[PDB]
Amino acid sequence: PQITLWKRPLVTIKIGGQLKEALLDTGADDTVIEEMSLPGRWKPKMIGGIGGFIKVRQYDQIIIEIAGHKAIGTVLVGPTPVNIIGRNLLTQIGATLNF
């Protein structure tokens, strides 16, 4: 698809068998989703945003569908109001920015 930016670029994702809404975010290096349970072991990670740094849980090799495209990769879980799809998975679905 071709998505304009007059509104937030929200799409549906499916993770752990659940539908959720998430933001396609070219300014996020990594994908960060709201607290939920995921399978397997996690590793610690620090990420920095507009207000400072926080601790999140890093889960590798997680299956996630994004706007109907299958991806498998790293998902960080932490306290956020929004699910954010960052560049590590935008590249797996072939997304580019165009103007």
Ligand X SMILES: COc1ccc(S(=O)(=O)N(CC(C)C)C[C@@H](O)[C@H](Cc2cccc(-c3cc(OC)cc(OC)c3)c2)NC(=O)OC(C)(C)C)cc1
What does the binding site for Na ion look like in residue numbers (CB under 5 A)? 40, 60-61
Q: 29 catalytic, yes or no?
A: no
36 forms part of the interface with Cl ion (CB under 5 A):
yes
Asked whether position 2 contacts Cl ion by CB under 5 A, the answer is no
User: Which residues neighbour 2 within 8 Å (Cβ) at sequence distance 6 or greater?
Assistant: none
Local structure of residue 91 (DSSP, 8 states) = T
Report the SS3 class of residue 87. helix
Query: Which partner in Cl ion, its own copies, ligand X, none is near 30 (CB below 5 to 8 A by kind)?
Result: ligand X
Residue 45: CB partners within 8 Å, gap ≥ 6? 55, 56, 57, 58, 76
Question: In this structure, what token pair is assigned to residue 16?
Answer: 């752990």
* Number of other CB atoms surrounding residue 87 within 10 Å: 15
Residue 44 contacts its own copies per CB under 8 A: no
Q: Which is nearer to Cl ion, 52 or 77 (CB)?
A: 77
Size of residue set near Cl ion by CB under 5 A:
6
Name the residues annotated as catalytic.
Answer: 25
Q: Name the site residues for Cl ion (rule: CB under 5 A).
A: 4, 36-37, 73-74, 88
Q: Name the site residues for ligand X (rule: CB under 6 A).
A: 23, 25, 27-30, 32, 47-50, 79-82, 84, 86
